[PDB]
């Protein structure tokens, strides 16, 4: 099923966001970080920062590869960013659910704490950007579109301004408008696609990621 696939979607065009920077490209996360190039690189425009040592600009085999892997590591440690039980090997040998919640500690680090746990900070800034809407989740509240065009319109008044008189039962079209606004006029990128984000089963982590770009 295609909802299973969100995650790793809106994670790979939220990374590619950055590797722009440094003219690099994801196209499948489960191998493209292994020679730790990437990642590296990733790291290196979140951070602001260059790496504590020098790394193998050419990871020819597999033993070069594991210590570029071990630099981003020991970056991310010195930068007391905890790792959820994430060891070279994972990353190298394209655990893909390793690495993906590899990923989700960048965002929520980066996107979210640096910028109370990190989605209790969002939500709160969420809700007070909307008062008048109960916010109380990442996933169902955002099904309709509504509370897209809601978020967009707080943010830039005029953009959506009739988001409350939205048609619930038109998710995709209202999603698209308030992205596409938000695109266009806020420059927040579609890290989420609005056929993903109304998605009756969407990964919330990803809802998280799309709206992590708002503040």
Same mark, same amino acid.
């Given at each position: ?35 730790? $190039? ?35 590591? #020991? ?22 659910? $390793? ?8 965002? $929520? ?12 900070? @969002? ?9 008048? $809407? ?13 509370? @897209? ?27 698209? #408008? ?16 609005? #056929? #993903? ?19």
């Amino acid at each position: 099923a295609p909802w299973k696939k969100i995650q790793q979607n809106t994670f790979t065009r939220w990374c590619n966001e950055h590797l722009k920077c440094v003219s690099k490209r994801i196209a499948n996360l489960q191998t493209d970080l292994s020679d730790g $190039l990437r990642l590296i690189a990733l790291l290196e425009v979140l951070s602001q920062k260059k790496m504590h040592r020098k790394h193998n600009q050419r990871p020819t085999f597999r033993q070069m590869q594991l210590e570029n892997v071990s630099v981003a590591l #020991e970056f991310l440690d010195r930068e007391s960013i905890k790792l959820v039980s994430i060891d070279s090997k994972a990353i190298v040998d394209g655990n893909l659910k $390793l690495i993906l919640g590899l990923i989700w500690t960048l965002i $929520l680090h980066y996107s979210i704490s640096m910028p109370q746990t990190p989605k209790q900070r @969002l939500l709160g800034w969420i809700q007070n950007k909307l008062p008048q $809407l109960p916010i109380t989740n990442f996933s169902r509240d955002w099904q309709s579109g509504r509370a @897209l065009g809601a978020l967009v319109d707080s943010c830039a008044p005029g953009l959506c301004p009739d988001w409350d008189s939205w048609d619930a039962s038109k998710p995709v079209t209202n999603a698209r #408008e308030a992205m596409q606004q938000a695109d266009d006029w806020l420059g927040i990128p579609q890290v989420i696609t609005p #056929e #993903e984000i109304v998605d009756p089963n969407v990964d919330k982590h990803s809802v998280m990621t799309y709206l992590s770009q708002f503040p």
